[PDB]
Design an enzyme around this catalytic site. Structure first.
Site, PDB file in Angstrom:
ATOM      1  N   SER A  46       0.847  -1.212   0.000  1.00 42.96           N
ATOM      2  CA  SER A  46       0.000   0.000   0.000  1.00 42.96           C
ATOM      3  C   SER A  46       0.866   1.239   0.000  1.00 42.96           C
ATOM      4  O   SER A  46       1.619   1.438  -0.988  1.00 42.96           O
ATOM      5  CB  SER A  46      -1.135  -0.090   1.030  1.00 42.96           C
ATOM      6  OG  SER A  46      -0.721   0.343   2.317  1.00 42.96           O
ATOM      7  N   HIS A  88      -8.528  -5.789  -0.687  1.00 41.24           N
ATOM      8  CA  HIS A  88      -7.516  -5.009   0.019  1.00 41.24           C
ATOM      9  C   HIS A  88      -6.419  -5.874   0.640  1.00 41.24           C
ATOM     10  O   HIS A  88      -5.634  -5.360   1.448  1.00 41.24           O
ATOM     11  CB  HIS A  88      -8.165  -4.124   1.105  1.00 41.24           C
ATOM     12  CG  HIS A  88      -8.799  -4.896   2.225  1.00 41.24           C
ATOM     13  ND1 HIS A  88     -10.160  -5.112   2.304  1.00 41.24           N
ATOM     14  CD2 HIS A  88      -8.262  -5.497   3.314  1.00 41.24           C
ATOM     15  CE1 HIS A  88     -10.431  -5.822   3.386  1.00 41.24           C
ATOM     16  NE2 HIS A  88      -9.297  -6.069   4.017  1.00 41.24           N
ATOM     17  N   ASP A 118      -8.625  -2.859  -7.095  1.00 41.94           N
ATOM     18  CA  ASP A 118      -8.152  -2.627  -5.734  1.00 41.94           C
ATOM     19  C   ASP A 118      -9.167  -1.793  -4.942  1.00 41.94           C
ATOM     20  O   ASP A 118      -9.673  -0.782  -5.437  1.00 41.94           O
ATOM     21  CB  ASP A 118      -6.795  -1.927  -5.817  1.00 41.94           C
ATOM     22  CG  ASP A 118      -6.204  -1.620  -4.469  1.00 41.94           C
ATOM     23  OD1 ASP A 118      -5.400  -2.423  -3.960  1.00 41.94           O
ATOM     24  OD2 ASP A 118      -6.536  -0.550  -3.927  1.00 41.94           O
TER      25      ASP A 118
END
Ligand SMILES: c1cnc(Oc2ccc(-c3cc[nH]n3)cc2)nc1
Ligand SMILES: *[C@@H]1O[C@H](CO)[C@@H](O)[C@H](O)[C@H]1NC(C)=O
Length: 342
Positions: free
Chosen positions: A145, A287, A242
């Site tokens: 991330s 995620h 995503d």
């Protein structure tokens, strides 16, 4: 377990001035080193950094960090959980700078917070060289991330640092997980990155900076724009749908307009990866990240990510029989790949 070490240079700090650090598990019989950058959004002005300090303080301070952490996923030392690099030296670098790993500003009279992400990486590397990193053959800088974007922003600077310090034999490579975003049309925010860079004194890779020039450095936070400027080998992992991308696009899960929007997003992401030879991009809404314990389960075209990473290692010793490294789904809707995470 990985053991905490606070930086000996106590001027390289988390947001609140407490020292930054790293968690380490050594493997004396290995010359492979994995340095993993934690993620978790960012903050971009005084008021929204103050709110993050109230309810996300471990991402702004080392005062409450635990003495140990357990390595999971790609950071696990068990071969059953980590078929790729289970015997490597393992390093987890906590994200306590709130700057997508780009900052180079200290706390002062004029600065309530320090934003030192780029300097934290450099100081961790420098202090590890005396704890065995000097003998490494490969240094893999990985992250998820905000840490995945951090890899793209910092991998070439680590390579330059090691060459300047006198270690030209260490091969520096990057693994960017869930950090490849699109500056696309929303269904119903690049301004936050632009403001953040000024607030953090953020730094981007020099070749990308020279392309986009003054005031346009925000462009370098987008993988498809910064990747072609990099010299170190970089493997890109990105879900085609995503969840964080959809959140910023104001999509919350379908009628025709939203169906076309989601299908176009998948096609655009696949397009940006066409010229990325080492990549893993499944057609899933997720995620989930590569430090989760069941990271081995997802496959593209019958190949898992641990396998693809091993094939990448072999390729850096032309395509290899039965050992692919470019794995991008072509089916157009979330979960059209049956192996997507539940
Ligand atoms: C889940 C997803 N993302 C984060 O952190 C990031 C947020 C935004 C960017 C970004 C890059 C270019 N534009 N925006 C990168 C990382 N954290 C949790
Ligand atoms: C500590 O780090 C800062 C920032 O990189 C640097 O300016 C300073 O020289 C370092 N201190 C020592 C004693 O190396």
């Amino acid at each position: 377990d990985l053991r905490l070490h606070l930086l000996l240079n106590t001027s390289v700090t988390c947001n609140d001035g407490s020292p930054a650090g790293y968690y380490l598990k050594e493997s004396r019989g290995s010359r492979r080193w994995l340095l993993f950058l934690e993620g978790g959004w960012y903050c971009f002005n005084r008021e929204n950094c103050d709110s993050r300090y109230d309810t996300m303080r471990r991402l702004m301070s080392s005062r409450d960090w635990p003495r140990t952490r357990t390595g999971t996923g790609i950071l696990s030392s068990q071969p059953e959980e980590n078929p790729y690099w289970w015997n490597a030296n393992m390093v987890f670098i906590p994200y306590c700078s709130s700057d997508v790993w780009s900052g180079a500003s200290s706390k002062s009279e004029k600065n309530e917070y320090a934003f030192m992400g780029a300097l934290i990486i450099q100081e961790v590397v420098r202090e590890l060289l005396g704890r065995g990193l000097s003998g490494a053959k490969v240094l893999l800088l990985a992250g998820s991330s905000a840490g995945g974007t951090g890899v793209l922003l910092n991998v070439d600077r680590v390579a330059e640092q090691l060459e300047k310090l006198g270690y030209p034999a260490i091969q520096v490579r990057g693994l960017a997980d869930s950090g490849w975003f699109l500056d696309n049309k929303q269904y119903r925010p690049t301004e936050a990155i632009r403001r953040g860079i000024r607030y953090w004194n953020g730094v981007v890779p020099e070749r990308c900076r020279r392309q986009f020039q003054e005031g346009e450095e925000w462009n370098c936070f987008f993988g498809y724009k910064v990747y072609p400027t990099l010299r170190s080998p970089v493997f890109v992992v990105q879900w085609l749908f995503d969840e964080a991308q959809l959140t910023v696009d104001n999509v919350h899960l379908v009628q025709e307009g939203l169906r076309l929007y989601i299908q176009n997003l998948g096609r655009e992401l696949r397009h940006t990866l066409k010229d990325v030879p080492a990549s893993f991009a499944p057609a899933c809404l997720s995620h989930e990240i590569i430090i989760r314990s069941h990271w081995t389960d997802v496959q593209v075209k019958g190949t898992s990510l641990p396998r693809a990473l091993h094939c990448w290692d072999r390729s850096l010793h032309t395509p290899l029989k039965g050992c692919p490294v470019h794995l991008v789904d072509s089916c157009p809707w979330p979960h059209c790949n049956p192996s997507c995470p539940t």
